[PDB]
Amino acid sequence: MEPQSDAHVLKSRLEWGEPAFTILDVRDRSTYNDGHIMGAMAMPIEDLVDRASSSLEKSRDIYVYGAGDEQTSQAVNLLRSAGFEHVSELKGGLAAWKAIGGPTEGIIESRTPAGADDYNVVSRLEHHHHHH
Numbered sequence: 001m002e003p004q005s006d007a008h009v010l011k012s013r014l015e016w017g018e019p020a021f022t023i024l025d026v027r028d029r030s031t032y033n034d035g036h037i038m039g040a041m042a043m044p045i046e047d048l049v050d051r052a053s054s055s056l057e058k059s060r061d062i063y064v065y066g067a068g069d070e071q072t073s074q075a076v077n078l079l080r081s082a083g084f085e086h087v088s089e090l091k092g093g094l095a096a097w098k099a100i101g102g103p104t105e106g107i108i109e110s111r112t113p114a115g116a117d118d119y120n121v122v123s124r125l126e127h128h129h130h131h132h
Contacts, residue, residue, distance in 0.1 A: 001021070001061045001063075001086055001088050002088060003076070003087070003088055003089065004088060004089050004091050005063060005088045005089070005090055005091065006090075006091050006092065006096075007090060007091070007092045007093075007096035007097045007099070007100050007102060008100045008102070010023075010063055010090055010097075011097065011100060011102040011103075014039075014102075014103070015103070020061055021060075021061040021062070021063050022041065022056060022060050022061065022062050022063070023037050023039060023040040023041065023062075023063045023064075023065065023090075024040070024041060024043040024048065024052065024062060024063070024064045024065075024075070024079075025037070025040045025041065025042055025043060025044070025065065026043060026044065026045040026048050026064055026065065026066045026071060026072065026075035027044070027045070027065070027066050027067050027071065027094065028044055028045075029042060029044045029047075031067070032044070032106075033106065033107050034106055034107060034108045034109075035094070035104060035105070035106030035107070035108050035109035036094070036104065036105055036106050037065065037094065037097055037102065037103070037104055037105070038102075038103035038104055038105045039103075039105075040065070040105075045066065045071060045074070045075045045078070048064075048075050048078055048079065049078050049079065049081070049082045052079055052082065052084065053082055056084070058082075058083045058084045058085050058086075059085055059086055060084070060086055061086045061088075062079060062084060062086055062087045062088065063088050063090055064076045064079065064087060064088065064089055064090060065089075065090035065093055065094055065097065066093055066094075067093055067094070067095075068093050069089065069091055069092070069093060071093075072089045072090055072091070072093055073089045075089075076088065076089045
């Protein structure tokens with residue numbers, strides 16, 4: 001596994017090829033729930049090093065993906081800084097994985113902003129006067 005992997009390279013390696021890899025979500029804990037790669041595990045970029053050091057080994061084929069290439073690449077840096085040898089940046093991020101039609105999971109990946117219409121307002125006032 002090379003330091004930089006494209007979205008469909010990993011996608012094809014996931015479905016068509018052999019796994020033997022661990023995908024880390026470095027976007028955010030909430031964003032992980034919001035919508036993540038199918039099989040990806042929660043390791044938010046700030047907690048990433050500690051999380052991985054506590055679980056993953058340095059020779060584990062790790063594929064990291066963030067919101068953008070900057071977050072992705074920086075997270076990868078933080079892991080290989082912690083000694084991790086096999087760490088690759090998923091170039092393009094989740095939006096690329098999804099743009100190529102890759103298998104995903106999540107909560108918002110299910111529920112989307114839809115269903116809205118509101119106009120219940122009647123305009124008519126009355127002001128009677130003059131009485132004996």
